[PDB]
């Protein structure tokens, strides 16, 4: 994980994801005391994006499918960084946290989000 080796884009997005998760880890105690409401706006959007990122780091496995059932996904690095760019800049913030969980390939996250919203419309 160095710019010269992975591209400045990949390095900067990975560092931003690390900063986001670290800020959430520091802020869990304050959210336990104050709550998400008594925080600030930049901190609140940070916390929400961090929950979405932490659930996006999951994956259904080809070999763990045999007891979990989900078909299992292969996600290359290009779709990974294109999905994390979208989950980190404010392009996919109006989604449930349980929409990014246990998917690959952020298009599947938006599709499962639309299905989880159809669950509400129905």
């Amino acid at each position: 994980l160095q710019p010269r080796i992975v591209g400045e884009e990949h390095y900067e997005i990975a560092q931003r994801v690390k900063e986001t998760l670290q800020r959430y880890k520091e802020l869990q105690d304050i959210i336990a005391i104050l709550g998400l409401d008594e925080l600030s706006e930049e901190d609140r959007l940070t916390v929400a994006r961090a929950r979405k990122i932490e659930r996006f780091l999951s994956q259904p496995f080809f070999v763990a499918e045999v007891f979990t059932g989900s078909p299992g996904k292969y996600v290359g690095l290009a779709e990974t960084i294109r999905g994390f760019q979208l989950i980190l800049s404010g392009e996919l913030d109006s989604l449930p946290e349980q929409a990014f969980y246990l998917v690959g390939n952020i298009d599947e996250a938006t599709a499962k989000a639309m299905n989880l919203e159809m669950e509400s419309k129905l």
């Binding site: 520091e26 005391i33 925080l39």
Partner: protein, 322 residues
């Protein structure tokens, strides 16, 4: 048996770090409860100041002559100091008693015949150990400060002033303005303006920048506090009130409520600032215990490897001599 000594020392430092972060978090929760108490007790004083401002705008040409609001400039002084209850305090009680010494220093130099009304347990311990300063009453925090402590202090200050013995009853306390810096203030209490504002020791109406209703919001990833200017005050309108009581007696019965309001809010603010100082002190103590746990684990691993090396080298030396 030196390695078990270092193991137990490391365990003690781990436990001390754990309990210091626990104290930090429970002190933050009690800071939240103190701001709850403050913003819940505010609107009583809001309606009190609007009523009193209207009443004193209707009562300027009159003769009102209430003993609390008279100005008897024969210059005695009753400085009241309120300090922290328990210890570790950040640097609360030390700077409080230090400003107390500075104030009695300027006071005794002017021969104004001061006296002291100590409220906190640490402060009153300091004063019973140093009798060179005169002191009137003693109070404590095992009794709840939200009602009974403030009521007793208001009773004693009222009995000190209405029985016109001492002038210029002022209170030295610590408004919670920052999480790291808590500079104490000296505000006068009983020689009040009939308009009913909090004044400075100079009298220059520090209600101008009193900055009510502090709140806690994080800025980036660390805890800070936010203090704005004005909130939910409706003081303007002055309807017909049809006084049934004599107007001098109305203020004569109104001003003790203002005494109680100011004393209670100052107690609550000093309590919240003491809890904030304790939160900061316990954060620093947790971090120092973390760094000490790291250093002690390093020295322990060094000593363990040196012990193993020496043991096997001694065994091999004996086996080679044999």
């Amino acid at each position: 048996a030196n390695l078990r000594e270092l193991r137990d020392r490391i365990g003690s430092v781990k436990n001390t770090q754990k309990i210091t972060e626990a104290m930090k978090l429970v002190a933050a929760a009690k800071v939240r409860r103190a701001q709850e108490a403050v913003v819940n007790g505010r609107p009583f004083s809001e309606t009190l100041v609007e009523v009193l401002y209207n009443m004193n705008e209707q009562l300027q040409t009159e003769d009102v002559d209430v003993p609390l609001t008279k100005i008897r400039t024969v210059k005695k002084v009753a400085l009241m100091v309120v300090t922290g209850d328990r210890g570790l305090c950040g640097g609360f009680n030390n700077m409080l008693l230090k400003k107390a010494e500075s104030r009695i220093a300027e006071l005794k130099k002017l021969g104004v015949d001061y006296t002291i009304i100590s409220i906190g347990k640490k402060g009153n311990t300091y004063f019973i150990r140093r009798p060179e300063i005169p002191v009137d009453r003693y109070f404590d925090g095992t009794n709840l400060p939200t009602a009974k402590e403030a009521q007793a202090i208001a009773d004693d200050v009222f009995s000190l002033f209405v029985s016109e013995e001492v002038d210029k009853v002022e209170m030295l306390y610590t408004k919670f303005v920052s999480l790291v810096k808590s500079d104490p203030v000296i505000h006068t209490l009983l020689p009040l303006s009939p308009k009913g504002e909090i004044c400075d020791i100079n009298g220059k109406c520090v209600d101008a920048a009193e900055d009510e209703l502090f709140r806690l919001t994080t800025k980036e990833g660390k805890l800070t506090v936010e203090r704005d200017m004005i909130k939910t005050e409706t003081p303007a309108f002055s309807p017909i009130l049809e006084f049934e009581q004599d107007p001098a007696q109305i203020l004569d019965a109104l001003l003790p409520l203002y005494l109680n309001s100011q004393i209670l809010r100052a107690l609550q603010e000093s309590l919240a600032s003491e809890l904030a100082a304790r939160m900061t002190a316990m954060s620093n103590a947790t971090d120092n215990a973390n760094e000490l746990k790291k250093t002690l684990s390093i020295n322990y691993n060094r000593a363990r490897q040196a012990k193993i090396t020496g043991e096997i080298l001694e065994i091999v030396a004996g086996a080679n001599a044999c």
